[PDB]
Amino acid sequence: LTEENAKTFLNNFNQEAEDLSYQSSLASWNYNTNITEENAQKMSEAAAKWSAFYEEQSKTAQSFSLQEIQTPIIKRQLQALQQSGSSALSADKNKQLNTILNTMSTIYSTGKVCNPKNPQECLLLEPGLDEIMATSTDYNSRLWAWEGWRAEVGKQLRPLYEEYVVLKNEMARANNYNDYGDYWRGDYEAEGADGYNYNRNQLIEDVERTFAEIKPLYEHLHAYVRRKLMDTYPSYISPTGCLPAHLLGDMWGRFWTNLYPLTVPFAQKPNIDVTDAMMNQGWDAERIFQEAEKFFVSVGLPHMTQGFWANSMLTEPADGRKVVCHPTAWDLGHGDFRIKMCTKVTMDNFLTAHHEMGHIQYDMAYARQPFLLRNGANEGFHEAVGEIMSLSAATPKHLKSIGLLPSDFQEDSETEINFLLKQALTIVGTLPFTYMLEKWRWMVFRGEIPKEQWMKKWWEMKREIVGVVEPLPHDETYCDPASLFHVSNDYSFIRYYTRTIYQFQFQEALCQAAKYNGSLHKCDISNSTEAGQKLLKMLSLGNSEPWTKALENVVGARNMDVKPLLNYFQPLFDWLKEQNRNSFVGWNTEWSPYAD
Amino acid sequence: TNLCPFDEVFNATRFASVYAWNRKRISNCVADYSVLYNFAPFFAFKCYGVSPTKLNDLCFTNVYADSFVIRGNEVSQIAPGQTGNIADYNYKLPDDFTGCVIAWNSNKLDSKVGGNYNYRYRLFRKSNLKPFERDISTEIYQAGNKPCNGVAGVNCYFPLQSYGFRPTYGVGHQPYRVVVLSFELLHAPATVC
Ligand SMILES: *[C@@H]1O[C@H](CO)[C@@H](O[C@@H]2O[C@H](CO)[C@@H](O)[C@H](O)[C@H]2NC(C)=O)[C@H](O)[C@H]1NC(C)=O
Ligand SMILES: *[C@@H]1O[C@H](CO)[C@@H](O)[C@H](O)[C@H]1NC(C)=O
Numbered sequence: 001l002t003e004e005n006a007k008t009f010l011n012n013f014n015q016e017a018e019d020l021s022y023q024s025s026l027a028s029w030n031y032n033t034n035i036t037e038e039n040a041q042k043m044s045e046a047a048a049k050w051s052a053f054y055e056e057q058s059k060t061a062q063s064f065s066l067q068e069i070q071t072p073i074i075k076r077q078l079q080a081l082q083q084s085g086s087s088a089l090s091a092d093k094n095k096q097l098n099t100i101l102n103t104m105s106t107i108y109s110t111g112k113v114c115n116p117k118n119p120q121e122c123l124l125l126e127p128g129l130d131e132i133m134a135t136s137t138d139y140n141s142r143l144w145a146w147e148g149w150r151a152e153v154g155k156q157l158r159p160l161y162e163e164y165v166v167l168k169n170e171m172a173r174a175n176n177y178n179d180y181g182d183y184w185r186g187d188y189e190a191e192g193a194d195g196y197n198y199n200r201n202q203l204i205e206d207v208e209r210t211f212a213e214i215k216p217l218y219e220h221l222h223a224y225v226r227r228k229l230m231d232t233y234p235s236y237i238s239p240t241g242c243l244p245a246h247l248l249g250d251m252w253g254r255f256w257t258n259l260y261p262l263t264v265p266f267a268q269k270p271n272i273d274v275t276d277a278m279m280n281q282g283w284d285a286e287r288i289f290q291e292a293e294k295f296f297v298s299v300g301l302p303h304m305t306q307g308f309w310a311n312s313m314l315t316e317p318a319d320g321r322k323v324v325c326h327p328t329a330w331d332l333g334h335g336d337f338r339i340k341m342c343t344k345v346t347m348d349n350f351l352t353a354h355h356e357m358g359h360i361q362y363d364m365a366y367a368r369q370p371f372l373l374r375n376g377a378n379e380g381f382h383e384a385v386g387e388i389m390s391l392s393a394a395t396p397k398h399l400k401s402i403g404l405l406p407s408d409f410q411e412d413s414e415t416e417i418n419f420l421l422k423q424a425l426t427i428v429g430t431l432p433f434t435y436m437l438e439k440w441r442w443m444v445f446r447g448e449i450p451k452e453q454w455m456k457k458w459w460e461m462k463r464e465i466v467g468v469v470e471p472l473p474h475d476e477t478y479c480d481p482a483s484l485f486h487v488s489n490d491y492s493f494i495r496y497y498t499r500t501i502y503q504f505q506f507q508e509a510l511c512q513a514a515k516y517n518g519s520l521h522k523c524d525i526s527n528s529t530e531a532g533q534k535l536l537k538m539l540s541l542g543n544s545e546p547w548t549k550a551l552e553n554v555v556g557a558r559n560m561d562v563k564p565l566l567n568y569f570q571p572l573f574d575w576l577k578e579q580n581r582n583s584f585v586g587w588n589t590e591w592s593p594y595a596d
Numbered sequence: 597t598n599l600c601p602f603d604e605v606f607n608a609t610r611f612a613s614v615y616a617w618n619r620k621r622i623s624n625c626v627a628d629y630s631v632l633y634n635f636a637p638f639f640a641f642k643c644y645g646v647s648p649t650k651l652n653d654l655c656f657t658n659v660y661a662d663s664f665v666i667r668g669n670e671v672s673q674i675a676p677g678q679t680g681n682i683a684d685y686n687y688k689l690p691d692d693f694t695g696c697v698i699a700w701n702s703n704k705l706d707s708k709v710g711g712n713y714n715y716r717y718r719l720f721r722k723s724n725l726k727p728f729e730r731d732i733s734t735e736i737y738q739a740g741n742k743p744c745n746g747v748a749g750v751n752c753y754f755p756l757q758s759y760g761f762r763p764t765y766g767v768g769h770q771p772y773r774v775v776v777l778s779f780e781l782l783h784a785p786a787t788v789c
Contacts, residue, residue, distance in 0.1 A: 336766060
């Protein structure tokens with residue numbers, strides 16, 4: 001039978017997985033929103049039940065041939081069920097991996113450093129070091145905070161990361177994969193027809209095919225900031241050298257958005273940073289989220305569910321319970337959607353609200369697909385879907401419509417230039433970081449870097465690729481990369497590289513569909529249902545069709561494309577070239593600020 | 597005037613499962629359909645056979661009223677000529693159906709934290725139901741060519757599964773009490789007026 005005998009099995013599996021996976025999500029949400037000792041044990045048991053059931057179902061489903069039988073939908077569902085993955089380990093390995101992950105989470109969650117002058121006052125990262133890295137203007141204090149965070153947590157994660165990577169490579173080898181890097185890269189393998197084909201091996205060769213074309217755009221942006229930072233700390237900057245690793249606007253420098261007031265071209269024009277206006281006019285979290293929802297309603301997307309407002313966190317709990325303030329969008333299951341985020345009255349949070357609500361909208365779109373296909377087409381689509389809304393919501397014309405900007409405001413050459421520079425400082429600044437991190441982790445998972453050369457290779461590639469230098473050499477005994485949340489929680493990072501192109505492609509397609517004319521960076525798709533429908537017809541697909549077809553349905557392409565990004569950033573390249581007439585464009589590995 | 601017992605079928609502490617609906621023969625009563633709206637919030641009251649307004653000046657013979665509890669997605673499946681997972685194996689209506697349906701939401705009455713598994717529905721019936729057939733029997737359903745003789749394994753399955761209602765599922769997967777009325781005029785003196 002095969003086909004009709006597997007249809008019945010899938011019917012059995014779906015309406016049992018949908019009920020035994022909801023409890024684990026609910027327990028995880030309860031533990032995350034309220035940290036105690038009972039919730040952790042409840043989550044641990046609820047995860048174990050689901051793991052055992054998934055193992056049994058995968059073993060049952062593995063023996064169904066699939067040589068040439070079945071319809072494509074059944075074939076996709078059954079192969080997804082068969083692929084197994086993390087449940088092909090014995091109990092010993094499973095429990096060791098689980099306790100390693102738990103110890104990682106415990107160490108990273110409550111890391112602390114103390115002020116050298118005042119030993120009593122010891123600060124965490126969320127309330128204590130984020131503010132320092134964002135606003136602190138003392139070079140020595142910033143270096144102190146960076147060194148403390150790199151010296152406390154980095155000590156306690158090296159052996160854990162060694163054991164974790166060893167176990168992950170062993171599991172991936174057992175899962176008929178080359179390594180866990182190949183396990184990560186296998187998400188892009190599409191095979192559903194002729195022409196709609198892709199290979200795991202071809203992903204890496206497409207990365208540098210789009211990095212080199214972006215490399216000289218970043219060089220002019222890196223040089224201009226460094227010359228601008230020459231006067232900020234006149235002694236503590238070497239123009240004939242790279243940039244310090246701690247004066248990058250964050251703890252690691254993922255987003256250089258905090259450098260905008262220290263790199264703004266014009267100081268006389270009204271500042272597009274509307275945090276002051278938001279604070280003055282009397283805004284709160286409810287107002288922020290209602291304004292975010294009105295945008296999606298205007299585009300022509302469904303309203304937020306009634307339970308969303310009554311169940312979402314959206315605010316610091318205060319009270320007496322401890323929570324986790326990492327923004328997330330939750331899809332518990334059976335139709336439940338919630339958002340956990342510790343919102344504050346700023347603009348970064350204003351855009352993060354749009355990002356998370358875009359995640360929620362994409363999750364809502366494919367609710368009618370089968371359980372095994374209720375996923376995004378690939379890991380790099382959620383971020384792009386989220387960001388193509390912040391792109392339209394961040395424009396000064398949109399800011400003026402909601403009354404945030406003055407009603408006598410006038411757009412000129414200054415406003416467009418400033419807007420483009422602010423957007424570039426964030427979008428362009430994160431691509432080298434993402435590429436470096438993902439490449440380094442891929443080499444680590446392939447085992448090409450020894451334990452005695454991890455830091456050496458990491459910093460050498462950082463110097464020759466991104467172009468940032470360190471204030472004091474961190475010995476190999478530490479583990480610098482493990483200090484990141486995604487590294488310590490085992491999250492894929494190349495999605496953060498594919499977003500930076502898919503978002504621009506989707507933005508240009510929506511601008512063309514919305515009957516807009518003019519420059520690309522003044523689109524503001526609003527009150528236009530054409531773009532909404534064009535986006536929804538592909539959002540609703542889910543994982544049922546290959547990502548190549550999913551992309552084509554909107555863009556009319558079948559691979560990555562940098563041309564929309566270059567079109568977006570065209571008006572800045574020329575200005576940077578003209579303004580850098582006396583620039584020493586170029587960084588070197590040999591120049592290190594410290595002695596030897 | 598002798599009122600008709602509608603309050604004891606519209607106001608009950610517990611309804612019955614989908615696969616075994618609870619039929620009730622109603623006869624020799626004064627049918628007052630105005631008190632149906634006394635509840636007020638109805639998910640769907642548009643109904644077949646007769647005019648939207650009930651036309652209370654209609655005299656019928658015995659009338660059947662059988663009720664159950666389903667999801668919100670499957671409320672639209674209670675209609676003549678409608679197929680699916682619940683109108684083929686659990687409850688089917690005639691193509692010339694006379695009478696109609698009533699449904700409303702109830703989440704603060706029959707859905708408890710931790711889930712209640714007292715509501716069950718049938719799947720894999722092996723043959724689409726004829727109108728008004730119950731099939732309470734629970735024997736393992738054969739899927740293949742192997743004689744499973746009462747033990748559920750390999751490719752032989754158990755036909756009943758539980759809804760497991762919990763609060764905060766959303767309107768789609770949230771309890772909806774459903775009661776339907778079938779009007780009969782098969783000769784004989786007319787009683788239900
Ligand atoms: C946060 O979690 C703690 C325990 O994990 C909750 O404290 C208990 O909650 C359960 C749930 O009903 C009950 O036994 C009591 O309300 C609490 N136990 C005791 C001994 O007091 C706490 O209620 C949770 N916080 C919130 C806001 O739900
Ligand atoms: C249903 O019964 C409850 C309690 O018996 C009562 O409070 C309610 O009014 C009744 N609904 C009616 C009469 O419509």
